[PDB]
Design a protein around this nucleic acid. Structure first.
Ligand SMILES: [Cl-]
Ligand SMILES: [Cl-]
Ligand SMILES: [K+]
Ligand SMILES: [K+]
Ligand SMILES: [K+]
Ligand SMILES: [K+]
Ligand SMILES: [K+]
Ligand SMILES: [K+]
Ligand SMILES: [Mg+2]
Ligand SMILES: [Mg+2]
Ligand SMILES: [Mg+2]
Ligand SMILES: [Mg+2]
Ligand SMILES: [Mg+2]
Ligand SMILES: [Mg+2]
Lengths: 404, 404
DNA sequence: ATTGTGGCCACAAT
DNA sequence: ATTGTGGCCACAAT
DNA sequence: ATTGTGGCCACAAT
DNA sequence: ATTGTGGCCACAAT
């Protein structure tokens, strides 16, 4: 069935990390990132460490041979103390020398230091953190293998995409919703994807109170569609799907009404086709269950509007991590309705196979999973007082997966 | 997998009515009923009717050739008016001539007449009603075929039993619970089954108010176990299962406590083994759902105590009629627990294939289905003021399936 | 912060 | 007394 | 009351 | 305007 497309027109089966890695070695990734400096900084507090040298050697050989990113050099910067100012001084030194990305090794668990540095780096340059105490207790081959999937993605590469039928499913899918920081505060998100799983544009609102949810939900979605349309001016959106998720205020009927108005306003503004066909879906992870005795791709109808996708967890007991899918609004005709239901459910299943955090599928649609990654950063940068992250006006933050 | 055992040691596959009927013709039913008079009365208001003659001819040939009940004669009794007294006069005339059962043809839908006559007959002799206006608009072959399954069962025959492994599952299963007549009144039931699906003994309480539920639940169960033990004095019950069902008062923790006490008291009275292993299960029909794309026998674990059986309903859309199964109490050890879970769930699935109302399986466990049939009669005999039905003291009502 | 899952066991909840 | 949760830790993944 | 399921369509609910 | 329910009726089952 489903396969991943990598470089040189090649495709590999899903659910098979060994063949995916061998495929990258033979054919390269779907897109090799183009870089300005062809230079990466490795920033650490372990000068002359054997492990650092082994780590550097695996990184340099896999970037060249697996990712096909040629002529890269790694420069080292040593910080003298595990504190914000000392590390930041080396980050700034690396940026001053001219680098495309920073790999930053921290000595231990340190939530405030990590989120202060991470928010600074996300606002500056693609970056990848590492924990020396963890790295020193891992199979280094598996560690670096998965590390590079997400670092190459942060550099703007595309490791692999979904091989999907171009005539089925949505022109774009917008993952949208809000995530709660606490009982009162939240932020809205809206992330535009192609049906092949690649993210085109992402927007998040400022942190606001629950009372401001519906205003900022509409404005955040409008902003992401504007950004998508400016960066993809020749994209005609004739089939549009919203995936709504996140722990957010319980205003279901009011929320659906606002989301419908938003699509209608975007139609009037000619940001999507005047004849766009669209559906607004709620995607909810529900309680896991176990088949005690082929649910890969299975679709369950609970009512005309309510469905369940039996996603496998990533005693002949088969673990299922089901996904609730509710159609809360659509402009489909009765004659096309069930055809479209099948297509949107298949689409959600294909999107569940897209994950650039590592080689192994998360078995969770990227339209739900990537906002969760974003929420983890925004919440903790707020909690530990780092540098605010707002992608507006910042093309790198609007188009690259800095949340991986 | 599962098969039905019929006469002469033969067995036929489940889910295949054509082979079940051919099997009865070749080998007979599992048990042919022994009768006193070898005489059935056909009571109707259509003397010299061609249809009545066709009906009589099919009945007489199928009783002999399909059911292997030999030397039966059918006598006719004509009532002159479709009213209780006129029909009852012919019922009494038939009983006076000496008959094993009565087949009674009514002209049309008539709920008060039907339940007054039915309650009289259930208190007198095995009986089978028919509607002339329906019979005159049916394939007579299919009509009589299924008619005789339940009439032979009412005469004490055993059409077929489940072929189950004698070393797996319960020694007896007690279907118990209560059914509401209305918001205030209810009656309790308790029905003892073998694991092959055959009913050994059944008891129902008088109609009482909800305030008296737990008292009569305990007494009704005790009464059915006493009756079972007197009629099966050599039965050792070392493995016991309760299937609790019915719309009844929401007293879940109080009900479970009473059911546990009841088993313990029966242990102390040596009505079951002192070392009996038992479980008390709640069986609930839940909302149907449809697989849009092998659930025959599939078991789903929701928690250590909560399960779902995906029973098939009796667009490649597969209809499921799931059955919730909750273990509310058991004395199993941790080492035997999941082995026993599998056995009780398989058992419930096998019991879902037992139905003597007709040839086609109801796909609902007989421990739930037969109490529902009983509830329909008791409620309506109360509502339309027929003759109360209380099986206590009446061996025919305690041991035969008069509710089919 | 490469990421995960799963066993253990103290403890909370009832 | 029984059931469920959470926090460390071991270790798997190709 | 052999029993079922499924289509239709009026109507209730919102 | 849309969604779901219920009551007749056609008809299937081997
Ligand atoms: Cl349906
Ligand atoms: Cl489990
Ligand atoms: K370049
Ligand atoms: K440089
Ligand atoms: K759902
Ligand atoms: K006899
Ligand atoms: K006689
Ligand atoms: K259950
Ligand atoms: Mg608002
Ligand atoms: Mg369709
Ligand atoms: Mg990451
Ligand atoms: Mg009581
Ligand atoms: Mg076991
Ligand atoms: Mg009947």
């Amino acid at each position: 069935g489903l396969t991943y497309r990598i470089g040189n027109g090649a495709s590999v089966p899903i659910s098979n990390t060994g063949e995916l890695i061998k495929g990258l070695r033979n054919y390269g990734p779907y897109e090799v990132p183009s870089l300005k400096y062809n230079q990466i900084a490795l920033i650490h507090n372990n000068q002359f460490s054997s492990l650092i040298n082994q780590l550097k050697s695996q990184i340099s050989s896999k970037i060249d041979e697996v990712w096909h990113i040629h002529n890269i050099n790694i420069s080292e910067f040593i910080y003298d103390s595990p504190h914000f100012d000392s590390i930041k001084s080396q980050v700034d030194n690396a940026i001053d020398t001219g680098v495309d990305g920073i790999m930053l090794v921290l000595p231990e668990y340190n939530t405030p230091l990590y989120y202060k540095l991470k928010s600074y780096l996300i606002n500056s340059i693609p970056s990848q953190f590492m924990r020396y105490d963890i790295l020193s207790n891992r199979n280094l081959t598996f560690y670096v293998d998965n590390l590079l999937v997400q670092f190459v993605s942060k550099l703007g590469g595309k490791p692999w995409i979904l091989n999907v039928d171009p005539e089925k499913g949505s022109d774009i899918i917008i993952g949208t919703g809000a995530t709660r920081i606490d009982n009162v505060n939240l932020f809205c998100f809206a992330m535009v994807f192609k049906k092949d799983g690649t993210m085109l544009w992402n927007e998040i609102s400022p942190i606001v109170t629950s009372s401001e949810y519906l205003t900022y939900l509409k404005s955040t979605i409008k902003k992401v569609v504007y950004g998508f349309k400016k960066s993809n001016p020749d994209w005609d959106v004739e089939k549009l799907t919203l995936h709504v998720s996140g722990k957010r205020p319980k205003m279901k009927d009011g929320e659906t009404k606002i989301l419908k108005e938003t699509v209608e306003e975007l139609k009037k503004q000619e940001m999507v086709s005047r004849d766009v066909k669209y559906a607004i879906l709620h995607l909810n992870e529900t309680h896991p269950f176990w088949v005690m005795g082929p649910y890969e791709g299975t679709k369950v109808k609970l009512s005309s509007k309510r469905y369940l996708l039996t996603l496998l967890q990533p005693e002949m007991v088969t673990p299922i991590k089901p996904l609730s899918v509710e159609i809360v609004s659509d402009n489909w005709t009765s004659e096309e309705y069930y055809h479209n239901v099948h297509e949107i459910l298949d689409e959600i299943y294909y999107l569940s196979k897209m994950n650039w955090r590592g080689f192994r599928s998360r078995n969770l649609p990227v339209t739900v999973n990537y906002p969760k990654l974003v929420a983890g950063i925004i919440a903790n940068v707020n909690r530990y007082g780092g540098y605010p992250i707002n992608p507006e006006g910042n093309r790198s933050l609007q188009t690259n997966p800095w949340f991986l």
